[PDB]
Amino acid sequence: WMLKLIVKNGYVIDPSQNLEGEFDILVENGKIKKIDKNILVPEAEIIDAKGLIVCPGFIDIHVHLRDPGQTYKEDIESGSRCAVAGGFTTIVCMPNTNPPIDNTTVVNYILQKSKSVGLCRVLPTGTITKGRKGKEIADFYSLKEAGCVAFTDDGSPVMDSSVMRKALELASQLGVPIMDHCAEEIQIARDGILAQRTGGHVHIQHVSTKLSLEIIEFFKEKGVKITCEVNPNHLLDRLALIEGVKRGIIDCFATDHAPHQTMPGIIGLQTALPSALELYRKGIISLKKLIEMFTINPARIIGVDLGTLKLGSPADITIFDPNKEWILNEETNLSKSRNTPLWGKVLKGKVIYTIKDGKMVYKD
Ligand SMILES: [Zn+2]
């Protein structure tokens, strides 16, 4: 019983409030109490953030934790460690587990494990159809109760377009997004059209071409509730994506953390920041927009009240040094897996502290 914390001398950025400056942050009882220059109060621990950047906890809305089912490739505990070392305080896990997340029993398991491991907030998703088999519509009502924040069959074989349509009707009544993909243009246009028709929110999880981006942009100016994402690790035409980021058509970064233990792709959580900071060192995006795309943008997509430092919010805070050089290898790698071309290379930009609910959950 001794729990005020002050984060001092940092450079604070919070896009949601349009706050940027040399401020201090006072944290009382798990919540943000005050942002202001020059703070000192009795009975509080001081974190000295001189020379560091202080912003809302990162949120990643595209993670595979392989739990239950494949816990040798990765599991809730390792994933969680990976996420906080990566600056993430909330992650959304996909439902291609075994068994799949199509009933309250699995949802309930993932939350309980999550609370025990203690490190970051794990939000589950439910599948679109039972057993992800493709035929029948799952019970979106009960799965939303249990905690699911979105629905997706994660590749897939959807491709029956009437199913996809029932889903967006139901989703729309429930105020939760459907997540699709993992031919691309045909799919994306279909999704756009069904979204417009039903008024449901669809979120596209993979876009690889200029034409795909232009389609999304089109439906956006029509006021279609459609968003999309890109994995910053991928980014180093593979060149319209970079433009798509420049022009703000791509809403957020997400790693699509995909551990394997021998199409398929790559683990991500630990390198997302030093990867994305490459885009800033190239003047391609400002630092505020980079933080935006890890914080308030993904928060808005899954409709949770996070990714801000508004007074009263939960104290979810990432503190990072954008100039610190490190290497991902056995020494530093907190994944059970090592599948990433970035392995062994020199990264630039590292998280020094991650704070969740006013409590320090990672330290360098
Ligand atoms: Zn995925």
From Swiss-Prot:
Reported function: Catalyzes the reversible cyclization of carbamoyl aspartate to dihydroorotate.
UniProt xrefs under Gene3D superfamilies: Metal-dependent hydrolases (3.20.20.140), Urease, subunit C, domain 1 (2.30.40.10)
Control of this protein's activity: The monomer has very low activity by itself. Activated several thousandfold by formation of a complex with PyrB aspartate carbamoyltransferase (ATCase).
Active site, renumbered: 256
Cofactor: Zn(2+)
Entry keyword set: Hydrolase, Metal-binding, Pyrimidine biosynthesis, Zinc
UniProt name for this protein: Dihydroorotase
Subunit structure: Monomer. Forms a 1:1 stoichiometric complex with PyrB. The complex exists as an equilibrium mixture of heterohexamers, composed of 3 PyrC and 3 PyrB subunits, and dodecamers. The complex has both DHOase and ATCase activities.
Manner of cofactor binding, per the entry note: Binds 1 Zn(2+) ion per subunit. Fully functional with a mononuclear metal center. Does not require a second metal for activity, although the conservation of the second metal-binding site during evolution leaves open the possibility that a second ion might bind in vivo.
Substrates-to-products reaction catalysed: (S)-dihydroorotate + H2O = N-carbamoyl-L-aspartate + H(+)
Keyword Hydrolase: yes
NCBIfam families in UniProt: PRK09357.2-5, pyrC_multi
GO cellular component: cytoplasm
Pathway given in the UniProt record: Pyrimidine metabolism; UMP biosynthesis via de novo pathway; (S)-dihydroorotate from bicarbonate: step 3/3
Stretches that traverse the bilayer: none
Organism expressing this protein natively: Aquifex aeolicus (strain VF5)
Encoding gene (name): pyrC
EC number: 3.5.2.3
SUPFAM superfamilies: Composite domain of metallo-dependent hydrolases (SSF51338), Metallo-dependent hydrolases (SSF51556)
Residues that bind substrate: 64-66, 96, 260, 264-265
GO function terms (MF aspect): allantoinase activity; dihydroorotase activity; zinc ion binding
GO BP terms, alphabetized: 'de novo' UMP biosynthetic process; purine nucleobase catabolic process
Domain of life according to the entry: Bacteria
Family: Belongs to the metallo-dependent hydrolases superfamily. DHOase family. Class I DHOase subfamily.
